[PDB]
């Protein structure tokens, strides 16, 4: 069945997109309408170099829900 949840592949794509502003503060929502994701670096991972961030353990994710997408 259709999952209706954000996929890890797509969240990793967003991490590439916002990598320059990625920090311990939540990112902007990945979308301007409908459902997307916000990401941040876990505070306990703030000392790590960019090339040693584990997706599952060093990155926090949360669903964000924006206004209904217009036609």
From Swiss-Prot:
Subcellular location: Cell membrane; Cytoplasm
Domain of life: Eukaryota
PTM statement from Swiss-Prot or TrEMBL: During host cell invasion, proteolytically cleaved at the cell membrane in the region I by a papain-like cysteine protease of parasite origin. Cleavage is triggered by the sporozoite contact with highly sulfated heparan sulfate proteoglycans (HSPGs) present on the host hepatocyte cell surface. Cleavage exposes the TSP type-1 (TSR) domain and is required for productive invasion of host hepatocytes but not for adhesion to the host cell membrane. Cleavage is dispensable for sporozoite development in the oocyst, motility and for traversal of host and vector cells. O-glycosylated; maybe by POFUT2.
Glycosylation sites: 32
Lipidation (GPI-anchor amidated cysteine): 69
Boundaries of every TSP type-1 domain copy: 17-69
Sequence intervals crossing the membrane: none
Cysteine disulfide partners in this protein: 29-64, 33-69
Application of this enzyme or protein: CSP immunodominant B cell epitopes are primarily located in the central repeats. Antibodies against CSP and particularly against the central repeats can neutralize infection at the pre-liver stage and thus makes CSP an attractive candidate for the development of vaccines.
Recorded domain comment: The N-terminus is involved in the initial binding to heparan sulfate proteoglycans (HSPGs) on the surface of host hepatocytes. The N-terminus masks the TSP type-1 (TSR) domain which maintains the sporozoites in a migratory state, enabling them to complete their journey to the salivary gland in the mosquito vector and then to the host liver. The unmasking of the TSP type-1 (TSR) domain when the sporozoite interacts with the host hepatocyte also protects sporozoites from host antibodies.
Role played: Essential sporozoite protein. In the mosquito vector, required for sporozoite development in the oocyst, migration through the vector hemolymph and entry into the vector salivary glands. In the vertebrate host, required for sporozoite migration through the host dermis and infection of host hepatocytes. Binds to highly sulfated heparan sulfate proteoglycans (HSPGs) on the surface of host hepatocytes.
Similarity comment text for this entry: Belongs to the plasmodium circumsporozoite protein family.
Protein name, entry field: Circumsporozoite protein
Organism of this sequence: Plasmodium falciparum (isolate 3D7)
Source species taxonomy: Eukaryota, Sar, Alveolata, Apicomplexa, Aconoidasida
First-to-last residue of the parent protein present: 310 to 374 of 397
